[PDB]
Design a protein around this nucleic acid. Structure first.
Lengths: 252, 365, 1096
DNA sequence: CTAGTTGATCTCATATCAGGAGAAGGAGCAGAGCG
């Protein structure tokens, strides 16, 4: 079995299945787990980011690292269209995770609050939709979640939407985002995503805008004075190295 | 002393014995040396002094007049009497001189070529000692009470900055990122101090009567909040868990970093277990401070028993850290003492004060 | 940059720690002794100790404990170094080869931390579940062992008691439980914690804290039947098991504190306890049915002051002393009629703390001879150290032109060599040497008209003689010659060889093999070889039958050492030597392990190979160059083993110690021939023939350094030599208790004459200080001048001042009263030694302790507490101040060269002072502004100033190249690992420049010398490569070991060549050597390293 | 009871001159104590 520096025994019969970039991503995720910080798996689509997440969480459960004897209760907030896919992925990679879906389709056939209580009581792997986070935002956030994975976390791109507030109402240090593009329109979305994964790293959104967004866009025009473009370049460099150790993005 | 010399010479006692015992004796014999002077260059009160950590030869000094002075503390003259000459100075004519009071100044640890200084002009300037020019400036939205670089981190080179804002700014001197903020305090952060033991432990003290230990890697708030009582008065943490009954205006880790000394405007100094933030219940008596800004105080290093030199009004009160017994009061200043700094190489003390003087305390005999 | 070469003349001898266990094998009982950097592994035989290995750590061994993990066959050794290198070592013996494999290693230093006052404690759980280390205050470092680390990843547990005095792991505990005595302001308490390896924290201990004695300082974990702990304090011994609390306060242990302890039994019914006075106690636990009924302490006797002590078996105890000779004592059941059961069996020399020393060219030779103030309180002594074997001649006979020596027993009944046959040019001369009487007589059976190539006693109560023509077998008992063999062609014999059974003679190019039988000389094996014969030897080794099965030869024109099969004279092995000089001497001899073949040339070259009894194959060729003249080898069996002797213009006794061959010098002029001799009057004596006479002497020990011991029974402090008076002035100190009473007769109390200081200037246990005048021949205390009450004699200088011609002993003293921290009073007394009496010539009351004095161009340079002043000696015979210097914290060390004064300060470290004579005052030339706490200082050259820091470092300051010219630059840095007490110019022997010896607290005598830049660069490169090749015991890096180290500074060494590492270059096999010398040839570097080893 | 379909309902994106009279504050200042 592959072993990391402090001791994180990712099983050999899973770790061997990953690709080189996937193993690098698991390494990066576990570095975050040691620093007790969150990140963005900003790898574009098709590389496979769910495989990295299940591999890392499975290694964290088998390695029994500890708070919690191994991995505790984790919540995965993904669009409905992929929820069942997620459970199948777990069930084919690491069976012994008691994975459960929170949905009207579901499988619980009883009160959903009882499902949250039971799953947390077994340190299970619970999958929701963003709407359920928004609606039960007071209820679902009472059972000491150990991980929060916002798959397709660009649903958080708006720092105003009720889904953003409900998702930022979680308390764990561990916040991972699986988005093919952290930003889509402008830097509001980058700020919102970083406010999710790491509450304090980037400043308050006013500060962030006034330091980064306005200078960069002002230096994005070809009629800008030379001072403007040079300041835009410098500020872009500062934002890049500030976000370097927490956004793992790989291209094709 | 002859018994000590013989025991060192014959191997009965470890030489560590003679070092620590004689250093302790020198600290207890610490007294105002009129046989040594520091050249008076500040037109205003000295708020901060910092002797370089490597070689302990040069000292920085920041005054309320906004100037910085860089002194040589070695007796380069052959006489037994000398004046600590001012090597360099960021004076009123330096283009980068601070517009307001220099409240803190710190040598770059690991090398003497760089030092950083913060002011009430809402700037933390990084100075290249050799050229005596600013290499970087960190502007903040509100006036800085204290800054500190980790004396121990070979990995990160963050400056923890406490301003009047409720947030603690972390500025990376390695490529410049002053965006990180540690939130959880409610009033001005009057003191910040990195642990000398752990690269990433930062203790921050604020006017909201709380001291918090942070793990700047962590993304989930303060590790520990210091509590006077340790649980005797326990409340859902919204207003309780105060380190002091007033503003906490001074922080200092002990030499080994296993304890933290906090001084607050409740006229108390408390000693805390730096790992679980438990009050050690060391008494220290009454430690008079009414400072409205950060109070810079130091501890001894490399002695048999550790000491803390705390500004006590116009005097410097010397206490034993782990018993509270006040060793003495060094009385030579004419106004309130703002900062004292310890030369561990020779058990010497330098104290600045609002009387625009820096007094050297040397061991007698 | 400066270029210095440091080497160890005498390895440290003080034992800082010893443990016993089954380390070398599951069945053996080992005694492992840690001397400072040397680890000595012994095997405890029924008699004495048989050494097996001595390894050098790259580290000061701070902790050393043997432990047996589950499943291990034999004990592993845990070593922690002062620099915090931890290693677990296993002993793996593969036949002849012995190795110390490092099963794990690491560095356990916390980057910051207050090193604990009491010092490094290292304890091991009795079930080997963990190693606890207390290195720093407030932390307790844990190295788990069930988890097989190779890096010893260790974790701290925060220990809330910040001043822990001692700690042990308790026995019989489900979990690892530490029991420690700690000091808090309310007193000393014994507390227990259980260490939880999985939670990595302490848990509540089995038994609550107990408030104990004020000076409770030692904890003894008591084995499983009882469990619990015994806390030894100053006045009481208390036992805790959680509910049982026994206490005794034996008055007998109140006199001194117990500093070492040891469990005699496996169930801990008996403990040995050693105190600072050297008493040895037995603590007995009387059981009841099992619980413990009561404790008893009884005084067994007296030993050396034990640092550690170990019970081996059968009442034999190894007493490890740092201050005196270690001892191996025996515990008899009954007293010796003087109340003591302790009987010292053996004493191991310890140059204890070398507090001062002088190199005196005593015996008016050209060789220095260290005289050291060694030892301490009861163990104080003067040790005289010289690099020589010590002929110790008893008689001589002036017999010019000797060419042969052989011992003979002319009397049949006697087994003694009471006759000597000698060959000179063409004839045979016999000498009777009956008892002490020596005369020249003729013995029956020997031809006086033919030369004697060889002769000797053989079996069958027979003698045999090989002359240049024939061989004559003398029947000693019945009559004259009865068996004689003559070469058929009447060719002369060119070389001879013979042993107790057989013969091998060389005639021209042909060899004849003869076997001696009663009334018979039978030839068996014969051949005519390729070239002429040069030298031979057939001495049987490990004979066990009566015959040697092998042969060694040297041939001409194919210069090579060949081996032959004796019955057939076939060619077994060949090693080619080369050169234009034929071999002269060939010998085969056992050295402590197996058979070695020693072959030498006519130019002093000498080759030793490792020979085997089956094949006869020479392996591990190593070459050594001794002498510039031909050599011969002769074998003599000393007390211990055979010590071959090399006879040349540089006579050199060869033997092997600790399974390595070494070359001890013999310091007479020249030795052509030698032979052993044990006559009724001469036991184990030699017979050294030179060109002129035959000196008949014995050699005491052959340890390279001969160490005399002059027991003082009191701590010596200073020593200076007065040549005109033929004496040493030695400042000594003895501890008297009460008015006052000497605890024992010390040398000061037993002088020929005596005197007391009667001075008009100034008007438990106390130290009385004396000035001892010691005769430099007989080393008897000719005089003992006692100093005033409460006066500490610190410095002592011998010199002549001013212009008067008298030589004075000038003592600087200080007045010590317990109410003060620094002497405010002291005096300088000028004595003159004449007529066996010590008159006081002058005095000068000064206002501080005179820590140091040096005579300075006829003036006296003293250093009173912080002032350095120069005194003039007036015609009136009084000392008059001339100039002062005040800019010091405490000027402890003063040296001088010309007009410059090097002042070593207590903590400002050096100041180069110059006495500018035209003005009459001092001037600070330069200063080193680092805060190095000095232990000694020295001046190497006009511009190099050596200093020894109190953190076991050496540094060299150099006058630099304006105000930056006042900064001395530390151009040399080196972590010596020893606390140097004294530097002194001189060398112990008759490329390198200068020579500074130094003595240390552990007994190391080292030697510093300057190299040139060329040599320094070459040797630094080799040093780097030997680090690349030599493998250290704890896998410690040499660079890390020699790194200058202080709690506030650490730099790699610079400007210093560890001569020890270089001289290990001779102790490696040829392939490894070839690896070392990749990028000139190896033999060149042998020239260099040999020339380097000659300097010490 | 179980899906499956179908509406409602909600969340989230992307755009740049012929008044008067009184009350309250404030300022200039004369003067009186008074340390």
């Amino acid at each position: 079995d592959a072993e990391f520096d402090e001791g994180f025994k990712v099983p050999g019969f899973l770790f061997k299945k990953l690709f080189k970039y996937q193993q690098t991503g698991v390494r990066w995720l576990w570095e975050l787990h040691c620093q007790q910080a969150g990140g963005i798996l900003g790898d574009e689509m098709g590389l496979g980011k769910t495989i990295q997440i299940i591999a890392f969480l499975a290694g964290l459960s088998y390695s029994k690292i500890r708070r919690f004897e191994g991995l505790g209760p984790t919540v995965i907030v993904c669009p409905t269209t992929v929820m069942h896919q997620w459970v199948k992925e777990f069930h084919t990679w690491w069976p012994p995770f008691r994975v459960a879906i929170l949905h009207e389709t579901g499988s619980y056939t009883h009160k959903k609050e009882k499902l949250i209580r039971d799953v947390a009581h077994c340190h299970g792997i619970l999958i929701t939709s963003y709407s359920y986070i928004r609606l039960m935002q007071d209820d679902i956030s009472r059972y000491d979640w150990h991980y929060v994975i916002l798959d397709e976390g660009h649903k958080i791109r708006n720092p105003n939407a009720a889904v953003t507030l409900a998702c930022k109402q979680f308390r764990t240090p561990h916040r991972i985002i699986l988005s093919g593009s952290p930003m889509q329109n402008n830097l509001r979305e980058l700020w919102s995503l970083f406010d999710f994964i790491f509450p304090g790293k980037l400043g308050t959104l006013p500060v962030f805008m006034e330091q980064f967004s306005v200078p960069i866009t002002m230096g994005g025009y070809s009629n800008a004075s030379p001072v403007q473009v040079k300041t835009a370049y410098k500020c872009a460099c500062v934002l890049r190295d500030t976000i370097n150790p927490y956004l793992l993005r790989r291209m094709k | 002393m002859l018994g000590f010399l013989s025991a060192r010479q014959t191997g009965l006692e470890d030489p560590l014995r003679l070092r620590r015992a004689e250093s302790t004796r020198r600290v207890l014999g610490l007294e105002l040396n009129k046989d040594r002077d520091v050249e008076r260059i500040h037109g205003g009160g000295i708020n901060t002094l910092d002797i370089e950590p490597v070689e302990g030869r040069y000292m920085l000094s920041g005054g309320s007049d906004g100037v910085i002075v860089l002194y040589d503390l070695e007796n380069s003259s052959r006489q037994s009497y000398y004046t600590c000459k001012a090597v360099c100075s960021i004076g009123r004519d330096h283009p980068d001189v601070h517009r307001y009071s220099v409240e803190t100044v710190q040598w770059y640890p690991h090398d003497t070529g760089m030092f950083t200084s913060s002011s009430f002009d809402k700037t933390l300037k990084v100075w290249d000692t050799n050229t005596l020019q600013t290499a970087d400036v960190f502007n903040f939205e509100e006036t800085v009470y204290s800054h500190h670089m980790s004396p121990v981190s070979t990995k990160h080179c963050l400056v923890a900055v406490g301003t009047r804002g409720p947030k603690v700014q972390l500025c990376d001197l390695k490529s410049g990122s002053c965006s990180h903020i540690l939130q959880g305090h409610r009033q001005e952060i009057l003191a910040v101090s990195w642990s000398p033991r752990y690269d990433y432990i930062l203790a921050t003290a604020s006017a909201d009567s709380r001291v918090k230990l942070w793990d700047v890697r962590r993304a989930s708030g303060c590790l520990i909040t210091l509590d006077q009582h340790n649980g005797k008065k326990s409340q859902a943490v919204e207003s309780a868990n105060t380190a002091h009954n007033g503003k906490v205006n001074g922080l200092c880790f002990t030499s080994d970093g296993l304890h933290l000394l906090t001084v607050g405007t409740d006229n108390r100094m408390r000693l805390w277990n730096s790992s679980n933030g438990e009050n050690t219940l060391v008494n220290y008596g009454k430690v008079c401070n009414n400072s409205k800004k950060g109070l810079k105080f130091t501890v001894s290093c490399g002695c048999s028993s550790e000491f803390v030199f705390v500004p006590y009004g116009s005097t410097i009160a010397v206490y034993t850290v782990y018993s509270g017994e006040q060793i003495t009061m060094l009385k030579g200043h004419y106004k309130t003492v703002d900062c004292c700094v310890f030369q561990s190489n020779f058990q010497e003390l330098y104290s600045g004060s609002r009387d625009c003087n820096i007094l050297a305390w040397v061991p007698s005999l | 940059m400066s270029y210095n070469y440091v080497v160890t003349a005498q390895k440290p001898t003080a034992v800082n720690g010893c443990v016993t266990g089954h380390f070398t094998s599951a069945e053996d009982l080992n005694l492992l002794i840690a001397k400072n950097t040397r680890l000595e592994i012994y095997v405890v035989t029924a008699e004495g100790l048989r050494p097996v290995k001595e390894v050098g750590m790259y580290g000061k061994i701070a902790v050393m404990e043997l432990f047996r993990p589950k499943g291990e066959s034999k004990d592993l050794l845990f070593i922690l170094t002062a620099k915090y290198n931890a290693c677990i070592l296993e002993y793996k013996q593969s036949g002849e080869s012995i190795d110390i494999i490092t099963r794990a290693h690491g560095n356990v230093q916390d980057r910051i931390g207050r090193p604990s006052e009491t010092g490094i404690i290292g304890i091991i759980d009795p079930e080997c579940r963990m190693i606890g280390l207390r290195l720093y205050d407030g932390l307790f470092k844990v190295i788990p062992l069930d988890r097989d680390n190779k890096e010893l990843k260790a974790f701290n547990i925060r220990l809330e008691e910040l001043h822990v005095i001692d700690v042990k792991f308790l026995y019989g505990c489900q979990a690892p439980t530490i029991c420690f005595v700690y000091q808090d302001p309310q007193g000393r308490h014994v507390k227990t914690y259980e260490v939880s390896l999985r939670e990595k924290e302490f848990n509540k201990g089995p038994w609550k804290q107990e408030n104990v004695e004020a000076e409770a300082s030692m904890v003894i974990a008591v084995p499983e039947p009882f469990g619990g702990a015994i806390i030894i304090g100053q006045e009481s011994i208390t036992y805790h098991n959680g509910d049982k609390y026994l206490a005794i306060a034996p008055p007998i242990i109140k006199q001194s504190t117990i500093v070492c302890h040891n469990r005699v039994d496996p169930n801990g019914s008996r403990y040995l306890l050693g105190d600072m006075e050297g008493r040895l106690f037995m603590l007995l636990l009387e059981k009841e049915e099992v619980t413990l009924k009561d404790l008893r302490v009884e005084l067994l006797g007296e030993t050396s002051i034990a640092e550690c002590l170990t019970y081996l078996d059968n009442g034999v105890v190894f007493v490890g002393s740092r201050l005196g000779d270690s001892q191996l004592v025996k515990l008899n059941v009954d007293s010796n009629e003087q109340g003591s059961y302790v009987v010292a069996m053996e004493t191991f020399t310890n140059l204890g703390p070398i507090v001062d020393m002088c190199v005196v060219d005593l015996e008016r030779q050209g060789q220095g001879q260290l005289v050291t103030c060694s030892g301490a309180f009861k163990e104080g002594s003067l040790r005289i150290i010289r690099n020589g074997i010590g002929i110790h001649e008893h008689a001589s006979i002036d017999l010019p032109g000797i060419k042969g020596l052989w011992p003979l027993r002319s009397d049949p009944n006697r087994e003694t060599d009471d006759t000597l046959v000698l060959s000179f040019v063409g004839q045979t001369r016999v000498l009777m040497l009956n008892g002490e009487e020596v005369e020249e007589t003729e013995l029956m059976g020997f031809v006086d008209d033919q030369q004697t190539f060889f002769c000797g006693n053989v079996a069958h109560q027979q003698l045999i003689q090989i002359t240049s023509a024939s061989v004559r077998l003398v029947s000693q008992e019945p009559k004259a010659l009865v068996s004689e063999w003559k070469e058929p062609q009447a060719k002369n014999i060119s070389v001879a060889s013979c042993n107790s059974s057989q013969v091998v003679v060389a005639v021209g190019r042909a060899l004849y093999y003869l076997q001696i039988h009663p009334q018979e000389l039978r030839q068996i094996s014969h051949t005519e070889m390729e070239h002429e014969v040069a030298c031979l030897d057939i001495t049987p080794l490990g004979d066990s039958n009566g015959l040697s099965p092998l042969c060694a030869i040297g041939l001409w024109t194919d210069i090579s050492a060949r081996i032959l099969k004796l019955p057939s004279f076939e060619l077994l092995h060949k090693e080619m030597l080369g050169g234009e000089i034929i071999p002269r001497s060939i010998l085969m001899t056992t050295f402590e392990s197996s058979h070695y073949l020693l072959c030498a040339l006519g130019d002093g070259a000498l080759f030793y190979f490792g020979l085997n009894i089956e094949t006869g194959l020479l392996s591990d060729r190593k070459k050594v160059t001794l002498g510039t003249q031909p050599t011969v080898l002769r074998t003599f069996r000393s007390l211990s083993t055979t010590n071959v002797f090399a006879c040349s213009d540089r006579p050199t006794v060869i033997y092997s110690s600790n399974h390595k061959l070494v070359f001890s010098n013999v310091n007479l002029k020249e030795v052509n021939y030698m032979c052993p001799l044990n006559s009724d009057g001469y036991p184990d004596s030699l017979a050294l023939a030179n060109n002129s006479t035959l000196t008949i002497g014995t050699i005491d020990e052959i340890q390279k350094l001969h160490i005399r011991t002059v027991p003082l029974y009191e701590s010596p402090r200073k020593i200076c030599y007065q040549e005109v008076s033929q004496c040493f002035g030695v400042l000594s100190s003895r501890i008297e208790v009460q008015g006052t009473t000497a605890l024992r007769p010390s040398a000061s109390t037993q002088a020929l004459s005596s005197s007391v200081s009667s001075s008009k200037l100034f008007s438990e246990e106390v130290e009385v200080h004396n000035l001892l005048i010691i005769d430099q021949h007989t080393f008897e205390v000719l005089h003992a001048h006692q100093f005033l009450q409460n006066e500490y004699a610190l410095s002592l200088v011998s010199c002549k001042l001013g212009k008067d011609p008298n030589t004075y002993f000038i003592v600087g003293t200080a007045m010590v009263y317990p109410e003060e921290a620094e002497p405010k009073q002291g005096r300088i007394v000028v004595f003159q030694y004449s007529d066996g009496k010590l008159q006081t010539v002058a005095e000068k009351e000064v206002k501080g302790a005179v820590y140091s004095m040096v005579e300075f161009n006829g003036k006296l340079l003293a250093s009173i507490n912080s002032t350095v002043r120069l005194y003039e000696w007036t015609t009136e015979k009084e000392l008059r101040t001339e100039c002062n210097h005040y800019n010091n914290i405490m000027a402890l060390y003063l040296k001088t060269k010309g007009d410059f004064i090097l002042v070593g300060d207590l903590m400002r470290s050096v100041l180069l002072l110059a006495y500018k004579p035209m003005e009459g005052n001092f001037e600070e030339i330069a200063r080193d502004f680092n805060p190095n706490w000095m232990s000694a200082v020295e001046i190497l050259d006009d511009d190099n100033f050596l200093g020894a820091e109190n953190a076991f470092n050496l540094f060299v300051c150099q006058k630099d190249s304006d105000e930056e010219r006042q900064h001395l630059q530390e151009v040399g840095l080196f972590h010596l690992g020893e606390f140097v007490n004294v530097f002194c110019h001189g060398s112990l022997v008759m490329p390198t420049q200068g020579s500074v010896l130094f003595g240390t607290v552990n007994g190391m005598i080292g030697l510093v010398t300057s190299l040139s830049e060329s040599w320094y660069n070459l040797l630094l490169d080799m040093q780097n490569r030997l680090n690349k090749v030599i493998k250290s015991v704890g896998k410690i890096e040499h660079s890390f070991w020699r790194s200058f180290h202080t709690e506030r500074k650490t730099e790699p060494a610079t400007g210093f060549i560890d001569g020890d590492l270089i001289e290990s270059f001779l102790d490696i096999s040829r392939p490894k050597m070839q690896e070392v010398v990749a990028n000139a040839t190896a033999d060149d570097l042998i020239k260099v390293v040999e020339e380097l080893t000659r300097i010490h």
